[PDB]
Design a protein around this ligand. Structure first.
Ligand SMILES: Nc1ncnc2c1ncn2[C@@H]1O[C@H](COP(=O)(O)OP(=O)(O)OP(=O)(O)O)[C@@H](O)[C@H]1O
Ligand SMILES: Nc1ncnc2c1ncn2[C@@H]1O[C@H](COP(=O)(O)OP(=O)(O)OP(=O)(O)O)[C@@H](O)[C@H]1O
Lengths: 719, 719
């Protein structure tokens, strides 16, 4: 039903938001189609996309669809209402949607959603559901619409960060810091230039290539681990199968044949104690033809000790699925019983696997002497899995709190020898609460950068905030700057005010960047110039690993089409944007332009500097979250000084006196003269209009950014 | 000829050194075989292993083989003389060799060589050359012996660090810091625990896994590079060949088909401007079936800008081999002429390739209209290579000094966006001295971690110390500790003196490690115990990334078999080692034991603490490089106080007085009482002998390591 698309990357319309433009082909629309579309249009939506429920918490700012059924669907608005909930079904985040009806026979839906990759399409599924339902033979809910829904969800998953990365994303958001998808797939960037880090789940910018390659190199790790005195099996001396038999003789006959390379499943042979057992196993386990290492067998369960900043933050005991007898039920009946655990299944909530008597389970129960219908002795255990897994597993039943301090220390040491920040040592033991002295080669692998899917939200015991523990050593409370100060002016004197502010901040000693449609400027030089519509100039400054302050300087053309390239700022300014000429088209008087200028004022949180001589800019003070206002006036006689400063607010006032033409910053109970117009090259020799307000605004911006007077006067005089 | 082997890892015999034990099967040895063995035995050695030359600089401490010919070869000694030179031929480093003749009919060769992997075997080749020559029909030099030599050299190369790593090794040695082969192959560790880094040529511990994976990911790099505003071709939008033709249409028809994945050679199609040209090229260039990316063609030569710590340290212009006409010679004749360049060939010195009119060259000369026998116009150029290479190339003719500052800046920015410390930006341009504004997409690849074989020792222009520039940002002069203080006592009170010293250093605030045959102790805990013969206890402490001071504590059994696990120390000590019991066997009086104790005294460079009551330990002062001596005496009446301290030397003297039994450290012009024996638990309540000298020695060691008196008294009292 969709004809055209656009996206606001910034808050042109309150927050970043995609726009869907649709046309009604179904001229005899919902208002004249209620025979085949009664209450069931809503009931059908509840089943086709089962997030579209009568849930009071489902972004229900306005409870409208339940009052409309078919006669008043107002499909353009209904698509906006139903849009985003499909994305919630896919595990995506988003907000409200609104004001979809526009021109006759057309819709422009504004709906708030975090990702562009599946943007619009979610509304495609929704608008087609509503029209397709009308265009159907009273066919019910999941006519064919459930196909489109599942397809969408798969795509939404395709472009999603995995759960191990989402753990860090949520942890970043909860510490109030921004992030980006940086490398596609699961890698994100947290923070902005100068302070930012590229991180991917259990992988950080602090961990080197060498440490990771070492971690992958099992032969190297075993030697490095031995060099620490760790409790390791060592014995990595056998390549392939050493022509058979000899390979076990060299490490001791009771061996395990560990699969290597790409063997996905576990082509592992176990408990082989004779020449025949190993000779047969060697060419079975090495099913890849060249992917086996021969090690002696040690006994213990499968533990994982996840260490981040030295500290053990999580642990797991990846016990393979099994059954324990209750004294009455047989092996097969127990499987049916195990599968009644409400946490098992597929989709959301169901994080555990199911047990079936498949070939792996069958070989194991056969090894134990079972034909499936017999009854295990009470408390007898038969394993139906060889080890771990997430989809065929999901077991995670360990603790970090009862583990003997020395086992924790040996795991830390293993990680340090490699040089990793994050890893979960693969540790085998019969008793994790005893020291390593009784654990026969418990450390087997360093396991660098484990999926957190195996630690977060465990099957037993308390959970641990693995996401937060990782973020704590990346963006600690000990370092408060994660972002540059956002200090952005409006669609104004981007070629003069901007120079004065950049000079102030550079002379102050900050690295400052801006792009006044010209090549992007970082400190003393530039790169790319162009149609700086918003997101380009912003990422070119914000992601540049040098910048302390982001000024950017916006433009009206960019904003009306894309919004801002950033979502909010701390500091900003609005100077007059109207003149008797073309602005944005439309009205270009007070109106039209009022909407573009408010984009900066309403997103500024601390100090917005407003032009006090513009009666139609003054109104921004009634909307902006910023409270200082810093009214700037070229008229010493005004009301917004005495009825403003006197009440604790700020202003920049041009006045004449002992200091010639001077610009004075007023604040609460005092006032301090800063510059002469007579001394600023931008304003010639004084007695001039052009760039006087630009100098006043640069000073106002400087106030907000930490005026110390002396370096500001230098920056203002510099030009 | 070799029967048995052993190796000293430390200076049991002056420096670390392998030992070869050989037997003479050739009873009618060299002295009775001169008819078939005249001057030519030496002349033959000069040709079989052509490092065995009459070179005055060839470790020629003693010019002996030239005076011996056959009648006095003294083969056990001659093998020691000739050994190591084979290793020099392989590009290996080593020293002197000596004292090979031992028991009748047997040899024990001591020869100094850096690696164990090809140790002994080099002497195997040599001892067999000498015997095999005698056992031959006056057969000359390279009978079959040259086979064994070439085999050896190939093995020596197999276990060698590559030239790009050797660049860092030599740079590390020239800054006086130790290193180890850590990960086999080319990776080394420079420095010791607490200060050490794992580095591999153009790869350091400071560069993360994420930065390297990004560098390898060409699609990601092009987007990250575009986000900086770099002069890049971008256009990484085509997967495979996009079903043919369309792929070029999408980027512009004038395209280059760049090979991907494992394509070793250059399956690149160029200058394709039509539908037919690209359709044909697409299935030719993608010879792997799935390894092509389609990009538009940009013009320029192949430049590499190697950046390490921001700074451009080297550059190369990898101009493919070509010929330029001189107005007289044809293409084929010019090839013969080019190949007369003395730098071209194989082996040592010959670092450039040779030109042949092979298929690559032939296609290129055919494209230019040549049949090989025609004459190019003067200064006309025909390329006989598509690009670069080391073995089929070796061209490196750029500079770093004339490159326009902005091209250097764009290369730095490319490296930073990825997050690498080291890389050589792959930059295309027609003129590197002009800014990027005129270079049509010059940055193509980040090229992380390049072989230095393409930058070090260039074919034209000045060389640059790429090795040193890398070491400068790893082990800068701004950080002087690269190693722990080596503070090692002799085969003494390893269970008491050692505790007192460890307590002193821990109470002082240093992390100290030691292994008194017991489990290795690092700070407050331990791991592995065992036959601590030298190298194990040393690497267990020295490579442990926490330790500031390495005490170790040695033992006589370990030293007589392996030497020390370290090569030298700053501080050390010798207490009495003899008693009326078994020591090392042999003599066990003054002798036998004198040789094991001198191992510590003679490798101590600053302060060695000697026992002044032992007339047969005093003699160590005449051999040790250490000059303070710190004579320790339990007898207030001695001569080695008044004739020692008075002359500027140090001592620890036990004396009786106002402070009961006290231990006083004397130094040059003063003396300061430190402890009472009455207050040290090790010495009971005073009026005791056991551990008094151990306390005195711990205090002597503390002196050398920075006594501040107060934390030393605490460490001495602690026990
Ligand atoms: N000496 C040993 N004794 C007992 N079991 C061993 C021994 N060596 C290896 N194993 C088993 O082999 C398993 C290795 O499985 P594999 O490496 O294929 O799993 P994966 O899915 O690749 O994950 P990971 O590498 O983290 O184990 C260990 O988890 C352990 O159960
Ligand atoms: N747009 C282009 N215009 C001209 N030549 C190009 C273009 N893109 C790639 N090339 C050529 O393709 C070459 C790439 O060769 P290839 O990547 O196979 O070499 P390599 O041996 O793997 O080393 P490297 O990756 O460092 O280039 C570049 O060196 C350059 O000569």
């Amino acid at each position: 039903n969709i004809i055209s698309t656009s996206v606001y990357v910034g808050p042109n319309v309150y927050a970043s938001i995609p726009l869907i433009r649709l046309v009604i082909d179904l001229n005899p629309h919902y208002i004249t189609q209620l025979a085949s579309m009664g209450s069931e249009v809503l009931e059908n939506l509840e089943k086709v996309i089962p997030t579209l429920k009568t849930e009071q918490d489902a972004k229900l700012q306005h409870k409208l669809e339940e009052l409309r059924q078919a006669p008043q669907q107002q499909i353009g608005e209904l698509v906006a209402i139903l849009a985003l909930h499909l994305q919630r079904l896919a595990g995506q985040k988003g907000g409200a949607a609104f004001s979809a009806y526009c021109h006759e026979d057309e819709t422009e839906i504004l709906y708030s959603y975090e990702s562009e990759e599946i943007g619009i399409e979610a509304g495609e599924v929704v608008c087609d559901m509503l029209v397709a339902l009308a265009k159907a033979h009273e066919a019910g809910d999941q006519i064919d619409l459930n196909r489109d829904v599942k397809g969408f969800l798969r795509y939404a998953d395709r472009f999603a960060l995995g759960p191990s990365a989402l753990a860090l994303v949520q942890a970043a958001e909860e510490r109030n810091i921004p992030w980006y998808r940086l490398n596609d797939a699961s890698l994100i960037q947290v923070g902005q230039g100068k302070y930012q880090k590229r991180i991917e789940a259990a992988l950080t910018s602090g961990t080197s290539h060498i440490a990771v390659e070492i971690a992958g190199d099992k032969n190297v790790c075993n030697q490095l681990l031995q060099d620490l005195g760790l409790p390791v099996p060592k014995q990595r001396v056998v390549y392939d199968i050493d022509d058979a038999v000899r390979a076990a003789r060299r490490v001791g006959f009771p061996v395990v044949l560990k699969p290597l390379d790409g063997n996905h499943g576990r082509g592992v042979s176990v408990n082989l104690t004779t020449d025949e057992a190993v000779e047969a196993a060697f060419d079975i386990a090495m099913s890849e033809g060249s992917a086996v290492i021969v090690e002696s067998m040690l006994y213990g369960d499968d533990h994982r000790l996840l260490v981040v900043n030295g500290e053990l933050v999580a642990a797991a005991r990846r016990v393979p699925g099994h059954i324990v007898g209750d004294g009455k039920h047989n092996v097969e009946a127990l499987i049916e019983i195990v599968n009644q655990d409400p946490r098992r299944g597929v989709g959301h909530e169901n994080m555990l696997t199911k047990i079936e008597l498949d070939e792996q389970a069958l070989k194991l129960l056969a090894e134990k002497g079972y034909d499936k219908d017999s009854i295990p002795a009470k408390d007898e255990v038969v394993y139906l899995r060889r080890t771990a897994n997430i989809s065929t597993g999901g077991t995670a039943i360990d603790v970090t709190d009862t583990i003997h301090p020395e086992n924790k220390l040996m795991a830390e040491r293993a990680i340090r020898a490699v040089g990793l920040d994050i890893g979960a040592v693969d540790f085998l033991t019969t008793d994790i609460t005893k020291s390593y002295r009784d654990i026969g080669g418990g450390i087997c692998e360093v396991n660098a950068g484990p999926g957190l899917r195996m630690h977060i939200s465990p099957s037993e015991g308390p959970s641990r905030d693995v996401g937060g523990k990782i973020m704590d050593m990346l963006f600690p409370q000990g370092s408060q700057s994660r972002v540059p100060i956002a200090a952005i002016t409006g669609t104004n004197g981007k070629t003069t005010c901007s120079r004065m502010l950049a000079h102030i901040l550079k002379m102050a000693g900050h690295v400052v960047g801006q792009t006044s449609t010209d090549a992007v400027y970082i400190d003393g030089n530039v790169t790319v110039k162009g149609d700086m519509t918003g997101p380009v100039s912003a990422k070119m400054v914000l992601r540049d690993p040098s910048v302390d302050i982001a000024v950017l300087e916006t433009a009206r053309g960019g904003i009306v089409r894309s919004g801002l390239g950033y979502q909010f700022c701390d500091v900003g300014a609005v100077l007059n944007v109207s003149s008797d000429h073309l602005g944005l088209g439309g009205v270009d008087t007070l109106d039209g332009l009022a909407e573009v200028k408010r984009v900066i004022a309403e997103v500024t949180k601390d100090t917005v500097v407003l032009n006090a001589d513009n009666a139609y800019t003054l109104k921004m003070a009634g909307h902006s979250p910023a409270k200082h206002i810093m009214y700037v006036t070229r008229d010493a006689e005004n009301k917004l000084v005495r009825e403003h400063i006197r009440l604790g607010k700020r202003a920049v006032v041009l006045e004449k006196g002992l200091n010639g033409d001077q610009i004075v910053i007023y604040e609460n109970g005092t006032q301090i003269p800063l510059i002469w117009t007579h001394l600023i090259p931008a304003t010639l020799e004084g007695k001039a209009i052009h760039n006087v307000e630009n100098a006043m605004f640069a000073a106002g911006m400087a106030y907000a950014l930490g005026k110390n007077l002396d370096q500001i006067r230098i920056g203002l005089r510099t030009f």
